[PDB]
Structures are given as C-alpha cells and as structure tokens.
Symmetry: D2
Subunit: 276 residues, 4 copies
C-alpha cells in the first residue's frame, strides 16, 4: 500500500517521514511547474524535509495560490513567480529574484511540460514545435540560466522530469515522446559537461500518475484505463507522493554518486501498457 496522496493541488493532510526531516535543511529548490500536479507535490515534500522553494510557471495566480498552501502546511518559505520557460529574459528575471530573496539555489527541478493526445497526421508543425519548445528548449533554458547565475560557481543538482513515451513510440504522443527523449539525452550531456563543476543531473520518468492534468488529458476513457492499469505489473496507478519521493532521493545527498541517469518510476507500466 502506497504513501497517502490527495487528488487536487492541495497539501497532504498528514505525513510520515521515511527520509530524515532535515535531509534538505536550509537548501533552496527552484521548481518549474511547481503550482500544480507532480510539481506541487515535489514542492510540498521538499518543504517537509527542510527546503525552501521557488515555484515558477506561466500563471502568477496558479503559483500564488500554491505558495500559500505550501507555506501554510509546512512552515517553510515558498516564493511564487510568473515565468514562461520559453522566454529567456523572463527566466533570467525569475532566477535573479530567487537569488535576491534567498541568496542561493541548490536544486533545480524541471517539471514544466505540455501534452495532449493527437495523431501525428492531425498534428501541425506548430503543435509539435510548441511541445519541443516548452519541454526541451525550456528545460535547456532554465538549466543554462541556473548554471550561469549560480550552479557553475557553487555546484547544484538538477532533476529533469521526463517520460517513457519515446521507448516504444506510444500512439498519439509523437510530440511528447520526442521532446522527453531529447530531455533524457540532454541529461547525459549536461551530466558530462557539468559534473566537474559539482553539478549532478538526472531524469525521473513517471508512469500514469493519479490526480494530475497529465492523467486527465492523456489517460483516455476510464474503462480502458482501468483495464491497462490492472494489466500493469503493480496493478495500480502511481501517486504524486511516490513520484516526489523518487525526485527527493535524486535531488538529495543520498544520490551523491548518481549522475547522468534516468530513473524510471512507473510501476513497470511501459513494459506492459498497450500501444494500439
């Protein structure tokens, strides 16, 4: 039986520490996409282990609402910021402020993505490139800004949130599959070039996770969903807290020797899911 989760963008009402509560004490994590879904639960878990956060995505409203829930449930600081990962000046602006407020950033989680089901034949060039732009160029943009502004001189840890869609070429998902495959390759590249600056860089590829926009958009009809979930190895959907725990493992000193790796946390699902 998995750790408890909540379907909405709300904090866990109770929690049991399996990592020590001081694992990230006084560190600061910058989380793109931290106002909703997996990125919000990542923020919440990090703050429950001593970490302050900065959460950044397009909607200033989404992150303000989130930052008050996070701060309230954990007593740590959460700086919300409006920032499109495709706009380098907005990215530079956000990182500058995070540093003005905190004086340091230790961890970057690239969680910002967009996705929707569309057959390749109906997918426009602009549609495909929009997904490449947010997922891949966005991840590069934020990483590259964090490197210049803080990590190159102080070291750091980056976790990229990816997917397994590209492994078997999942139908209706050429855009997301291609974009997140490029992010897994970028992880290797940055691990190589930035390791000498004491920067670790890894990916975490989640399976179908309950209580997320990604599952609502992409899961398909509930009866065919249940049937594929029941046929997957752990016979269930993952939850956001399980994903936040793997991300926390990778962003922490427990993972001090892990770099350039892709941890798949998907209950086995890519091995068995249908690709009709």
């Amino acid at each position: 039986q998995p750790p408890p989760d909540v379907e909405g963008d709300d904090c866990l009402p109770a929690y049991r520490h399996l990592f020590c509560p001081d694992l990230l004490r006084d560190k600061v994590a910058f989380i793109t996409g931290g106002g909703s879904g997996i990125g919000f639960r990542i923020a919440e878990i990090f703050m429950r282990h001593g970490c302050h956060t900065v959460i950044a995505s397009r909607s200033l409203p989404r992150v303000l609402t989130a930052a008050r829930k996070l701060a309230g449930a954990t007593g740590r600081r959460c700086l919300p910021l409006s920032m499109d990962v495709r706009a380098p000046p907005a990215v530079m602006a956000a990182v500058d402020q995070a540093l003005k407020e905190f004086g340091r950033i230790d961890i970057l989680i690239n969680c910002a993505a967009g996705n929707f089901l569309c057959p390749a034949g109906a997918l426009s060039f602009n549609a495909f490139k929009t997904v490449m732009d947010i997922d891949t160029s966005g991840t590069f943009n934020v990483s590259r800004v964090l490197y210049e502004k803080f990590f190159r001189d102080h070291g750091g840890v980056i976790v990229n949130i990816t997917a397994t869609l590209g492994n078997r070429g999942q139908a209706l998902q050429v855009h997301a599959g291609s974009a997140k495959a490029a992010v897994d390759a970028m992880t290797r590249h940055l691990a190589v070039e930035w390791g000498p600056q004491n920067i670790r860089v890894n990916s975490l590829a989640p399976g179908p996770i309950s209580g997320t926009e990604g599952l609502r958009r992409l899961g398909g009809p509930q009866a065919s969903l249940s049937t594929k979930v029941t046929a997957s190895p752990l016979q269930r959907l993952g939850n956001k807290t399980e994903i936040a725990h793997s991300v926390l493992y990778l962003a922490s000193p427990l993972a001090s020797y892990v770099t350039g790796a892709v941890l798949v946390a998907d209950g086995g699902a890519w091995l068995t899911f249908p690709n009709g």
Copy 2:
C-alpha cells in the same frame, strides 16, 4: 571500403552489390541532397534506378548538384529550395515533386545543422535552432509527405540521426538532444503509420570523411587520427558506405524493418573519448 570522393561530386566509377534495378522508377525525396551524405545518397539511389528530388535552403547548391547527378547516372533529379522549418515552403516543394514525377516512394530526412559548443556557452536560440531544424524540421517534412502522398499510397522514410546522445558527447548537447528526439520520432511514426504501409527507420552514421559534419566537428587532425585508430574498425567511414546502409533501409530488402535504428559507425560510439 567502397570508394568515395571528398567533394560533392559524383563517383568516377561504381561497382554494384545491390542490383542496378533495386529502385527502378521509384522517386526519392532527399532533404539536404545537395551536399555531404545527402548528395551521395541521391547519387547511389539514382545508380539503382531511382529519380530524385533534392531540397534544401540554397537553390544554387541544389541546382549544381542536380546537374551533376543527372549527368552521372542518366536518371532525373529535381532541385528545390525549401527550409524544413517552413510548412508553406515544404508543402510547395512536395507539390512541385508530385507535379514533376506523379509519385514519391521514399523520403530521406538528412537536413541538419551542428557545430561544436560547450552547453554553458550555447545560447538559448542556438539550442532551439538545432532542435527546430533537426527535429521539428524532420517532423514537418514527414507529415507533409504523409498528407500529400504516403497516407494514401504507402512509403518509406529513413531519418539520418547520430549516436551523440547515447553517451552525452561533450560540445554536442544540441545535436545529441535533437537526434535522440528523431530516434523516438522514428518509433512513434512507425507505430502510427505502419497500417498505411509506411516504414520508418533511423540510420545513425559514425564520423564520415568528406563531409561538412567531420570538417566542423572532427576537432584537431592529430587528436582525430588518434580516436580513429583506437576505434573498432580503425578508420573513418565514407559517404558511399552510409549511402549503402540508407539504400538498404529504403529498399524492399528491408520490407520487415520498421521502427529500428541502424547504427553504421564502425563501432566508434563504443570507444570514442568523451
């Protein structure tokens, strides 16, 4: 190795190992077919009976190439100017091809852009441009050909990729990411399009002599010689060898191959320094 020539010029002689009618009367649309690997793929194709359309941004480049290719092989070569990033231009090119030949049987996505640069010095726009050309560019040509012809008649796509992303090669985050995304795209399209009789595969070349790629990315000649003699086959590959493996994938001999990546790199990704 089979012989090759360093320039974007035709082979002075060629020995057939495939039958000279392997692609008789087929039509191959080759992006980047005016130079480097793409020029040699066009030439080898035409020497197996195929007409070509070559397309890239520079009209002067494809015009001069097309005269060379027709002159050497006796088959037809249509040159077109088209940036793979511009759906109007790509649509216009595929129409022009269909108007000239009435069919396209094969698409070779060879157009790419690359250069050496540390990830920390690489600009936001430099990264995105490589993704736009290599990745979104490949998707754009593949989808325009699907809509205009391959959906209704079937077809074969060969994507020219790379091994850079396997080990995260230094100075290459842009190209390594873009070509890894092309390898996933290959699988996605193979699955979606297979039922329309379309095969889609990736061919990843190693370091190839006589190419802009190697000129830009090869590094100093002394350190290049050294990684080369320390790789499994002990030599650079040439363009003719790459054209043979592309021809294999594009031909009825690979009738059961789809969603695959064929690495043709003399074993180099296994031993090259990173």
Copy 3:
C-alpha cells in the same frame, strides 16, 4: 506491400528474384549453426543463391544431411552438413577443422542455434534456465571463439548473431530466452570492440515473429490471439524467413562494411506493440 516469397517447411524457394547481385558472396564460405531448419535453413539457401558455399552445423546429423541435399539441389553451390553441439567445445573445434579441410577458408559465421519454449519463471527449473543460457549464450561464445582462433584472428571475418527483442520489455513466459539473448547482444558489442582490429565485424539481427518456423509454432500461442496481436502490430503481418535472411545477408556482406557492434531489429515493429 508484398513480402518476398517464402515457404513454410524447411524446403527451398521454387523461384527467387534477385534484389542483391547474385555474385554478392561469390565463392565465400559461411558457417551457419542451426542451418538445418527454420530461419537458419532459409539463411543458408539465400546465401547460396548469392554465390556462397555453406557449412550447416547442429545436433541432428539426419536433419543437416537432408537440408544439405536440398540446398545443394536448389542452388548449385556446396553445403557441408556437420553434427555438432555448440555447448561442447571439442566437437565445435572438430567441426570447424573439418570445414577448413573441405573449403580451405571460412568468411562468415552466423550463430543461429538456440533453444526456446514458453514457461512461467516461477515454474522454470534451474536446469531449464541454465540449458537455454548454455545453448544461446555460451554456445554462441564458443563458436565465435573457435572460429576466431582457427581462422578469423588471422584472416578477418564477419559474425552475425541471431537474437531477439524479448528482453527489452521482459516478455512473459520468456525469462530464459530474453536473458540469453540480451547477453548475446552485449556480447556482440564486446567482440566488435576487441576484434575490430583483426578485421572482424560482429553484429546482431533480432527477428520478430516469423511464419513457418519452430519458434512461431512453439511460442505463438493460440491462433486467434496470435492473429489479434499480429493485426495490431505496425506492419499487420508476420515476417517470413526470406525477409530475415535478407537482413542477415545485408549484415554479412560488403554492403555493411562500416557496420559493427550494432543490433539491427527486423520485427515489423512487433516489440513496440505486442502485448505483455
């Protein structure tokens, strides 16, 4: 689009149209383990249709004597049948000596010998697992190693290992075969690196589900669900022996002069979509 023709039994093709030049392997000699039945037999026939003489070697002397009569009957090239278990190195060494005595050289080794059956991992005995590792993995290494020491080390050569995609997603009922074939894939890379400097190319070909083979008969399952998964796979059909032999011939030939350490999958995209 119409596949090249094939026949279901271990019999030669009635007609064949060349797509490779008929002198591609003019007067070369290929040693093919498992060349008496199934995929290995069709590989033998196709090679000999391109000028190559063959040695076909497996356990059952009756099987290879009958094959070799048929092969030589249909193509006008020579086929030496030998009885040899790949697990017994004195027998391999003697078979290879005998071939060198007959033909004076060997240019190509195709390692096609394998053992497979459906079995749940919880029912698979220790000896059953080991037996499949011993034939597929040790047996491949053994043959490759004898060929190296008897001829290829000094003369160069080309090796094609026939493998599978089962280990990619951990196909159920196939732990033995999937592990064994994943070892051979790794072995391909290892040997490509060590033996490249002796002018030896080593690649793997991984076939998908193939009509008119013992493999499909044993492992296909009932015809109705077999039909369903075939129809749901990207080319919507089973592969045939002739198509696999064409990919094997490609890799074994001078057209693949710069291909080594690679695994070419030739499965109609089956592993992307087949249920697990």
Copy 4:
C-alpha cells in the same frame, strides 16, 4: 567510507533509522565488498540480515562484525549460488531463524580481466553460471519459499560493462546484461504477487575486490577517474544508499528499472 570489510566508526542518518525496522534482508555476497556495506547500512536502518556466500569463514567473520556494530542479527550461511540444493538449504535456515524474508539482494558475482580470444569456454561459462544462473536460482528459490505467498523486494546488483562492450570483460558484460533483462522479466511476472524487482549498476567503487581486480594500473586508473563526470571513485556507502532506496517503501512504485549509480563513469571511461 572504510577500505576493508570493516564497519563504519560513525554514521549520520539521511533515511530514518526505522526505515527497515524488523525486516529481514538475504544478501548474497554479504561477506565482503559492496555486499558487506549493504548489510551494514541495512542493519543501521533496523533490518536483520542473512549473508550467504561460498566461504563460511568469510561470512562468520563478517556476521560478528555486522551484529557487533549495529546490535541487529546477522545470520551467516555458506552456499554456492550455482547449487540449487544449497540455496534451498540456506533459505530454509533463514526462515527457521527469522520466520520471514522481506528483501533479497543478489550481489554474488565473479569477474577478472581477460581478452575474449584468451578466455576459455569454461571461464566464460563460469561467469555466466555465477552471475546469471546464480541470480535466477536464488530469486526463484526465494519466490517458491516465501515471496510468491508474501510479496517481497529483489535488488539485482549489475553493471554498465555491456553498454559499450568494455574490453577484457566479454564474460561479465554479457552476464550482467542478462541479469538486467531478467530484472524486467521478473518485474513483469511477479509484480502481481506484490514483488518488486530492480537492478542497481555501480560504477568503479573504492575499497572493493572489483576495483583491485579490474581497475588496472594506478596511474591510468587515476587518469580515467579524473576524466569522469564527478571526478572521483564511488564509495561503498554511496552504493549501499542507492540499494537501500530501491529495497525500501520509498521505492514503492519502482519496478523493472535499472538505476545506474556510477558517477557518470560509463559515459566517459575509455574502451578499445
């Protein structure tokens, strides 16, 4: 960390000390190297252990040290992973002593440098028998004796050698690639019995027989280490942390995966 097969003098917790409270882990190769440090770090989180390998004096010595440093129980047993009667006997003994086994760590292996043209048939086969057949045998025994009916968690310790076909290592590369494939097959078959199965692939780890054997001359090893992304060797405690992660409830949704914990070394290390 500490070079020998000795316990750490001190240890600060990053996972809670009750993470594995009262669980039982059966660790093949638990008497030395990585296996010994895994047993120690598991015991520091509340776990009891069973350490099993061919040498009974090696595991007797290890067990007294592990118990002594941690106050948890460590049952040593002698068994060859290639002999299914012995594996069945050790597993029966662990069950008599403890009544349960929650976790299996398949750490036993044999390796040495040898060019492929010089490796004997028997030398190849031996490495395949220990790493591959051994790992299947222990997993399948544990499945039949306990995991099938009660669930459980397996961590296979593997390697990255097979990725680029590392020279001098055809045996070990092949064997470990087979065990990574087995990880996926068992994850799929046994997931519905509440069994998780993952691989952890370490890189070059200081204070181990692996590194003493396979590292080659010190000057050349220093060089490739400096040229690797984190510019240092891994230690045994870092590997035991990643193995603990996978073996714990923190990895409740991880199955069928390979975690590479090698400092990025396979990405840059020489080969040829």
